[model samples]
Target: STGSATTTPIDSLDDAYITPVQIGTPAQTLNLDFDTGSSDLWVFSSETTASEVDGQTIYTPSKSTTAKLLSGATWSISYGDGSSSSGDVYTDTVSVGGLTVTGQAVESAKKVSSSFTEDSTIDGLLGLAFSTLNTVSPTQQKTFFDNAKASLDSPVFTADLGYHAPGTYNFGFIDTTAYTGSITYTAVSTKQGFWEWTSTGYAVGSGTFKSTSIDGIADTGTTLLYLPATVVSAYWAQVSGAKSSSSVGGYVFPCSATLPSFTFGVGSARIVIPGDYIDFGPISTGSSSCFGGIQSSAGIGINIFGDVALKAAFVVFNGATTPTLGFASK
Candidate 1:
């Protein structure tokens, strides 16, 4: 089967691009973040501590006649940003768009980190990363895509996240109308359990391209682009008022400051982040302080091409042999 899901930014692309997913026999619809950074399909469920559950929708496995608990099975996951969730496992029917996967492991969160608890807009995360990173213990679980791919016409998905706009996640097929020009393909190294690739180089503003290959992951779960500290400093130097504070975290500048655009080289293709896109809104809505959408990776070790950088292109996450990546201008 083939299908596609449309999503909308929850807060100017500051958080996530959320899509609707249905779970269980009768179908409990939930708005979940389609995250490529991790591999567990976890949710805030009836099993979650009541105090931990706020305004977010809850997924109750007991209500589903088809929901079956996997005895002795459990899952736990933590993100690069330190947000985490842990839970018991349940096998249920999960559907995205028109595509359905039976007996998909549905992680029902019993404990969630502060970041997830605070973000009430998201019900859970739909992990699009490789199944090798799945969190189920005793026997690793399969992602919805992994379980559903065999039934699809082709094993592929496309991520079309937009800046302050509507986006979509297409399954089993690529829509030519959604993009322009031919896609530039790049080899992906999944040894790290991520859609990791080496960037040919990068350039700040209108500067000439540099040939410094940097390894990074294409993470939809991350809001900002994170590069090395040296790269971040060089980019910020172009903006007169930019300053970084360890206490405040990352770099910040005047909301009205003129910032330079950033470009990343993916093989022969280029993905550019516009200047205005760098200004990640005012620190407090109507303040002079503004945080950058691109920051230093710091302790994370690897660079991350997050939503901030991805919104500039149409991306293909191919699960075929070698797990290649295809990119085209949006």
Candidate 2:
């Protein structure tokens, strides 16, 4: 069932915010993990029963006549953390900001597990990154931007989210003013939906060390900052002294402590990772520490530079260009 119709594209830096995208018409409201990492929308259904799945909002197919299911079109996505979720395909009328895109592709999970099911309140995810990663059928994809494109005022979309704030997932129009001036969009890489790029190196407390090779995907879906072994340790060397104590998974530095500033030279854009995230809690090697900005994800596949660093600045992945990742407004 579609709601009020809209025919404009959303611009970045706008006051209009869109979240709780997949709301239950009659029964429930599911919070979604809006991600640019992949282009797919999924939600828990009546078939799912994972104990580890915490606080996540589930979907009720009975509410909307727009929801459709694909029996064998199920997919399983595994993250670098070894977390996985498996489910079938479903299409529904997805709506945001009073705009509804009919037959939009969305996921309907059947056998979700404890690892991914846990630690989240989102019932499903709305992939905002790219159109190429969209798994919806030929008819049409129901991506936030894709569906809303026909309704947004501009063709652009900016994700302005307060990571620690309630309703962390905010979307819709992109605010041009939120940016310094004109923003540059990176071309999409032919590789995969995975936003890939090479970093110039790491800079500590106002110093640059080009020798340290640090590269990873800037993902809006993730919260922790995972760094390569050498880069992770070296970064902590300068930051560890400023932290309070360490804990597992990350260093537990004061979330509100007066800390130094650091930046990553991505092409021409300089992204600053604040000291708050640098205090990743854990101190022991081999033990996941939160405060120590960098940790040894030695052979971890797909090192995603999660929201910990993303929220600091506005980021845009230009899919317009193929085989390239573009950056603007550091």
Superposed Cα deviation of residue 27, candidate 2 (Å): 9.2
Q: Write the per-residue lDDT of candidate 1 for residues 189-276, one digit (tens) a residue.
A: 9998899988899899999988898899999888889999888988999988899977778899987788899999989888888987
Sequence-dependent TM-score of model 2: 0.74
User: Which residue pairs in candidate 1 have backbone atoms (N, alpha carbon, C) closer than 3 angstroms, thus clashing?
Assistant: none
TM-score of 1: 0.98
Best by lDDT: 1
Misplaced by over 4 Å in model 2 are 1-18, 23-28, 50-55, 129-155, 166-173, 181-188, 209-214, 240-259, 280-290, 321-330
Clashes of 2: 45
Which one is best on TM-score? 1
Task: Please write out the lDDT profile of model 2 over residues 1-330, one tens digit for every residue.
Answer: 212212111112111122556443432455556666767787777667656456666677766666666555766666555666766777666665455566666677776767656546456766766666665544334466666665545444454444344223223345455557455444444466566666666676677645444557767666556767566655656644433233344435433445566676665556677666445443445544334444455556656676656665666543332434434443
Q: Give me the displacement of residue 96 in model 2, in angstroms.
A: 2.7
